Structure formats: C-alpha cells, structure tokens
C-alpha cells in the first residue's frame, strides 16, 4: 500500500519509526492493529499511526 504521511511524526518506541510530513512509505504488513501499520522508510521498517497518514493501497 502506498502510504503517505499527512503529518510529521517522531516515533515513541523502538518498534516504531519516524517520518516527515510527506514521506512515501511502503506498507509491507497489516494484520493486527487498526491504528498501526508496519511500513518501510529510510532503510528501516516499523509501526506508524493510521491517523498520521493518508492511505492509498
């Protein structure tokens, strides 16, 4: 899924990763939280909130 950050977000944990308002993410998985997506950025992969991004699968 083409994930696009609507806002600037700094992770809160080691499992999560940061993005700046406008990053292009790569959603590799989603199979639990209807609040956290496991996407890819900056040579890393982690959890990101669905309310801080505009989804386009």
């Amino acid at each position: 899924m083409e994930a696009i950050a609507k806002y600037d977000f700094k992770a809160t944990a080691d499992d999560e990763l940061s993005f700046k308002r406008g990053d292009i993410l790569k959603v590799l998985n989603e199979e639990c939280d209807q609040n956290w997506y496991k996407a890819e950025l900056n040579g890393k992969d982690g959890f990101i909130p669905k309310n801080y991004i505009e989804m386009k699968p």
Binding site: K6, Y7, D8, F9, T12, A13, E16, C32, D33, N35, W36, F47, P49, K50, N51, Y52
Partner: peptide, 10 residues
C-alpha cells in the same frame, strides 16, 4: 496541529 496518536497496545 497533528492528530492524537492511538494507544499502541492491543
């Protein structure tokens, strides 16, 4: 002012 982030604990 970005949204209130969800509680990341299921």
């Amino acid at each position: 002012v970005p949204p209130p982030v969800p509680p990341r604990r299921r």
